[PDB]
Amino acid sequence: MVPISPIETVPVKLKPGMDGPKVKQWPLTEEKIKALVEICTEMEKEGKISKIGPENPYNTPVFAIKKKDSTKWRKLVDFRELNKRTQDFWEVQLGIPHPAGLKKKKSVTVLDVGDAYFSVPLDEDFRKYTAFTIPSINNETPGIRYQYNVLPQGWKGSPAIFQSSMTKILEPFAAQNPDIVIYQYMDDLYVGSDLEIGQHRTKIEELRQHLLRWGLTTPDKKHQKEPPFLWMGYELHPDKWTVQPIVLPEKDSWTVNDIQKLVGKLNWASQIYPGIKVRQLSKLLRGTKALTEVIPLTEEAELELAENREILKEPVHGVYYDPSKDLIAEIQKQGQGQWTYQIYQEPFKNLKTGKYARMRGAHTNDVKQLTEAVQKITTESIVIWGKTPKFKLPIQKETWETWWTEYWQATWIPEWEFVNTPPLVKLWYQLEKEPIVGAETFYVDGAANRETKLGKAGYVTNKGRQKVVPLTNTTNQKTELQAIYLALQDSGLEVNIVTDSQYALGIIQAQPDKSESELVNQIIEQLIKKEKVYLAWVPAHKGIGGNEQVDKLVSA
Amino acid sequence: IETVPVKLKPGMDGPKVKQWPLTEEKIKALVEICTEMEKEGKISKIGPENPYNTPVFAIKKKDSTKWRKLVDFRELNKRTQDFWEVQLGIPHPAGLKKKKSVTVLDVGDAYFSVPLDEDFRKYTAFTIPSINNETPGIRYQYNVLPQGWKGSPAIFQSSMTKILEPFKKQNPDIVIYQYMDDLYVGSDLEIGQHRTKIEELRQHLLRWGLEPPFLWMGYELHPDKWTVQPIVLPEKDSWTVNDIQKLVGKLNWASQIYPGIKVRQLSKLLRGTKALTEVIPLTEEAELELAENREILKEPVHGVYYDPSKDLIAEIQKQGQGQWTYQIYQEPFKNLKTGKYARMRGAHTNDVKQLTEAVQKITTESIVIWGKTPKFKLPIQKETWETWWTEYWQATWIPEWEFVNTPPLVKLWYQ
Ligand SMILES: Cc1cc(/C=C/C#N)cc(C)c1Nc1ccnc(Nc2ccc(C#N)cc2)n1
Numbered sequence: 005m006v007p008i009s010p011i012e013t014v015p016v017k018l019k020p021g022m023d024g025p026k027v028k029q030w031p032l033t034e035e036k037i038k039a040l041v042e043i044c045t046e047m048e049k050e051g052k053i054s055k056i057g058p059e060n061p062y063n064t065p066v067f068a069i070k071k072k073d074s075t076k077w078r079k080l081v082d083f084r085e086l087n088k089r090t091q092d093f094w095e096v097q098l099g100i101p102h103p104a105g106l107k108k109k110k111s112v113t114v115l116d117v118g119d120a121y122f123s124v125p126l127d128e129d130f131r132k133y134t135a136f137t138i139p140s141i142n143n144e145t146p147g148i149r150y151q152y153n154v155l156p157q158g159w160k161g162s163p164a165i166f167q168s169s170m171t172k173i174l175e176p177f178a179a180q181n182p183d184i185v186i187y188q189y190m191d192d193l194y195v196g197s198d199l200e201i202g203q204h205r206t207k208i209e210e211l212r213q214h215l216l217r218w219g220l221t222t223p224d225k226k227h228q229k230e231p232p233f234l235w236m237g238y239e240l241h242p243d244k245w246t247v248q249p250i251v252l253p254e255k256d257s258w259t260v261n262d263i264q265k266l267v268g269k270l271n272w273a274s275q276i277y278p279g280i281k282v283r284q285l286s287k288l289l290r291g292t293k294a295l296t297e298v299i300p301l302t303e304e305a306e307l308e309l310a311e312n313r314e315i316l317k318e319p320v321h322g323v324y325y326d327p328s329k330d331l332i333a334e335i336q337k338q339g340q341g342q343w344t345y346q347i348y349q350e351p352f353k354n355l356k357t358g359k360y361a362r363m364r365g366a367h368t369n370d371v372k373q374l375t376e377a378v379q380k381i382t383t384e385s386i387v388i389w390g391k392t393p394k395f396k397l398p399i400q401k402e403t404w405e406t407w408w409t410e411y412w413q414a415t416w417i418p419e420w421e422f423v424n425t426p427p428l429v430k431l432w433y434q435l436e437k438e439p440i441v442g443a444e445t446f447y448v449d450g451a452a453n454r455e456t457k458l459g460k461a462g463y464v465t466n467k468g469r470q471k472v473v474p475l476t477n478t479t480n481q482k483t484e485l486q487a488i489y490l491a492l493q494d495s496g497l498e499v500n501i502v503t504d505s506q507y508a509l510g511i512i513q514a515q516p517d518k519s520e521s522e523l524v525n526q527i528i529e530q531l532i533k534k535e536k537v538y539l540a541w542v543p544a545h546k547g548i549g550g551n552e553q554v555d556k557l558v559s560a
Numbered sequence: 561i562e563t564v565p566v567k568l569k570p571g572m573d574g575p576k577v578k579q580w581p582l583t584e585e586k587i588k589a590l591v592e593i594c595t596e597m598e599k600e601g602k603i604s605k606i607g608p609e610n611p612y613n614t615p616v617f618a619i620k621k622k623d624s625t626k627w628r629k630l631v632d633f634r635e636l637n638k639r640t641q642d643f644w645e646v647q648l649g650i651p652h653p654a655g656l657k658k659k660k661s662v663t664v665l666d667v668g669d670a671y672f673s674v675p676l677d678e679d680f681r682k683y684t685a686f687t688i689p690s691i692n693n694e695t696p697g698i699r700y701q702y703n704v705l706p707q708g709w710k711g712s713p714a715i716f717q718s719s720m721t722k723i724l725e726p727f728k729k730q731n732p733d734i735v736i737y738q739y740m741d742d743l744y745v746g747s748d749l750e751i752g753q754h755r756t757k758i759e760e761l762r763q764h765l766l767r768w769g770l771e772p773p774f775l776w777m778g779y780e781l782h783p784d785k786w787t788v789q790p791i792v793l794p795e796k797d798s799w800t801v802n803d804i805q806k807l808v809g810k811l812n813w814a815s816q817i818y819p820g821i822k823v824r825q826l827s828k829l830l831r832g833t834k835a836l837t838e839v840i841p842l843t844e845e846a847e848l849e850l851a852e853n854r855e856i857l858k859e860p861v862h863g864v865y866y867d868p869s870k871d872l873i874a875e876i877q878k879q880g881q882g883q884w885t886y887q888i889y890q891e892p893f894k895n896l897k898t899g900k901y902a903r904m905r906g907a908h909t910n911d912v913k914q915l916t917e918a919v920q921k922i923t924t925e926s927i928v929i930w931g932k933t934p935k936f937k938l939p940i941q942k943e944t945w946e947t948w949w950t951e952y953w954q955a956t957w958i959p960e961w962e963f964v965n966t967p968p969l970v971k972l973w974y975q
Pocket residue numbers: 101105106107108109112185186187189194195196231232233234235240241242243694
């Protein structure tokens with residue numbers, strides 16, 4: 005015989021303080037026992053399990069499940085309890101490749117490595133914890149006791165230890181064959197290259213020879229699976245990719261669960277179908293979790309759905325990544341906090357698409373949302389391609405310059421160019437840096453009674469213009485905003501406004517163009533109509549004229 | 561040569577911190593660095609029985625062409641036992657901040673000559689990711705004291721004191737202070753003499769070393785010239801209503817720092833409902849009150865003391881045109897240091913690069929003055945900072961930070 009290299013075992017431990025499982029074996033029918041004895045006898049012959057004496061105190065239950073439409077039983081060793089007690093492992097498959105980062109391949113061959121799985125030995129010192137018992141016929145003899153010598157299917161550590169063991173085996177072959185790519189998924193190896201089929205088939209046989217150094221055999225009747233591959237919800241082809249078919253159901257009525265599944269499908273589709281939207285459909289699940297509750301579809305959601313059905317009318321495919329070319333990302337504003345983007349290298353040939361939704365918040369503006377979308381696309385692009393795309397953005401260079409030089413926070417977007425495709429992102433208002441000569445000065449204030457919720461808002465000006473409005477069901481904060489609104493409403497196109505409201509200044513200095521507060525939205529609407537607005541802050545209750553006068557009028 | 565036993569803090573597992581996305585350039589640099597480190601026995605490949613992780617990235621030091629590996633041990637440093645075994649504290653040298661020149665040396669390569677406790681190595685695990693996760697991340701752990709881990713200067717301290725004994729005896733007026741991977745060497749000499757003494761000091765470590773990739777570099781500071789920012793009020797011949805309003809606002813803020821500040825008489829000038837741009841003559845009761853406030857503001861703040869048991873906090877404000885103001889404190893309104901920058905290096909069109917360079921300068925000042933790093937309150941959205949700060953980082957340590965989402969009104973008063 006030909007010596008084979010052993011597969012180094014991974015040392016395994018139980019979590020600190022914990023012991024192995026001691027779980028009672030369920031009674032089984034005489035029929036199941038006979039089937040398990042036959043199954044385990046074969047497993048024992050193949051070296052996967054070994055009979056143990058009565059010293060071992062651990063146990064995991066074993067079951068017999070009838071393979072549907074067949075007289076063949078199959079065994080299930082239920083390791084739920086051992087898994088709770090087994091240490092955590094490094095899990096490598098946490099991040100899966102995105103198809104848009106893959107490279108085009110001329111050939112991709114599949115190799116079955118299911119036999120290698122049971123060549124990976126289990127750490128000798130851990131085997132005792134995998135003990136199980138076949139009950140005896142009529143319970144008149146001791147049950148037959150076994151333990152595993154190989155990685156048990158269903159045990160917590162088997163995926164990680166199998167992956168790590170195969171990686172170590174494959175590393176030297178990949179390193180010395182930089183003209184192929186190797187990928188492990190389940191019990192299959194996927195091998196791709198740009199070589200002429202002859203050289204490619206040679207590499208495959210050389211890989212089989214390399215694997216045989218560890219005694220690992222691969223079926224010679226080559227794999228039935230061939231391009232296209234159905235994988236992790238995608239279809240992989242040699243020179244393009246897409247998502248598996250997206251079929252939106254027809255329904256006369258929709259439940260919470262149906263809408264959750266619909267949005268999940270739209271989200272999955274949005275990575276290659278441009279323009280998918282889910283805002284209005286997602287709004288319907290706000291707060292509720294009555295899985296079976298029916299929700300009427302708003303007219304807004306019906307239009308969104310209809311718009312989506314059209315986008316999904318026919319198949320769309322992405323191309324693969326060419327590292328020799330720049331990556332370009334283009335973004336469009338869609339409305340209601342929704343943004344959509346495409347990443348491509350050659351015009352009209354997208355690698356992938358995607359969307360971004362406004363974060364939950366009281367106040368926002370388009371420039372901030374565009375900025376957030378850019379950072380999201382940047383980070384996703386680092387993951388998939390290892391570098392930042394050049395951006396094409398619907399904002400003028402002069403608009404961006406004005407924004408970031410005057411914004412109170414540090415902010416940055418990477419190399420980008422203006423793309424003139426409406427809706428353009430713009431600054432709707434900008435406050436003055438200095439008081440305006442010749443503009444009327446409005447001293448504003450508001451106050452409310454915490455108990456009655458009655459209040460007043462108003463202003464007094466240097467020209468003797470005055471107004472006070474009585475208010476109900478209000479708060480100090482709302483009356484302070486109401487006073488600023490009144491001054492905007494009653495002033496000319498240029499106006500100086502003096503407030504003592506730190507709350508109102510906090511909001512306005514954040515430069516929102518849209519708010520959850522209808523009062524802030526009204527203030528924004530007025531700001532947009534002005535030519536010049538200077539907002540000045542003074543501390544309350546300090547004898548500052550104008551401020552003192554109106555504070556008295558509204559606090560009465 | 562023999563390992564110091566090291567433990568985590570009680571009831572505390574190892575770090576399990578996600579590796580953040582790295583550019584192709586940084587991955588390729590780390591693969592080359594780690595391949596060589598593995599050959600030299602500094603690191604070894606690890607298996608899946610090690611579930612721990614600490615992030616890694618790569619930087620380019622101030623004025624260098626070569627990538628340096630930087631491990632972000634912030635989580636491991638929090639979870640590592642405190643080191644007071646052989647000593648009861650290494651009092652921070654209060655004189656370091658008074659020298660005319662302080663040079664900062666990267667001496668971290670020296671730590672690689674001491675082995676790490678075999679039972680602790682698992683907790684230094686890190687991963688080199690692959691683009692698009694197409695190949696399994698490369699997993700390694702340290703066999704020797706790692707750069708950036710708080711225990712490395714502690715364990716290496718004995719070795720370091722003996723390496724420097726001849727240089728200290730022969731240069732007794734020199735202040736030498738070690739923080740993490742840095743050596744701070746302060747003197748009062750002519751900078752030409754200074755650089756020689758520094759190169760003298762390098763030779764001691766190269767001599768003991770028998771090569772360090774970044775020991776030859778030198779970050780030159782001059783803490784004797786570090787400026788502060790007292791509260792100053794305008795001196796004007798013509799005060800508008802708006803000017804006086806701004807003055808009363810600033811004085812109201814200052815009165816939280818200085819007890820005796822008064823505004824009654826200045827407010828009185830704004831008796832009525834006047835146009836913001838109208839000029840108001842100062843009556844003399846107001847001129848006196850203002851002079852009295854000016855004199856108050858020339859004195860130090862009362863009851864300001866440093867407590868080494870409390871966190872330092874650093875706040876930064878963007879003032880525009882490349883200017884940044886900052887304050888370091890432990891208790892509100894009790895500033896231990898204030899300052900202002902404008903000369904931010906090669907970042908005239910990049911806010912975030914400027915802020916990152918300000919964070920590093922403030923941290924350096926904090927190390928020199930108190931021997932620890934402050935917790936930053938940063939005027940930036942989390943997602944913007946986290947996407948970009950690693951691109952401009954040039955220091956071998958990393959401070960902690962939080963984010964300011966609401967505009968502070970006090971920016972106006974530090975301008
Ligand atoms: C992630 C991955 C999944 C599968 C297969 C998963 C499954 N099932 C097969 C391979 C070879 C890979 N690895 C890589 C790495 C770099 N480029 C590519 N490009 C590439 C892959 C498949 C097809 C096709 N058809 C075309 C190009 N694949």
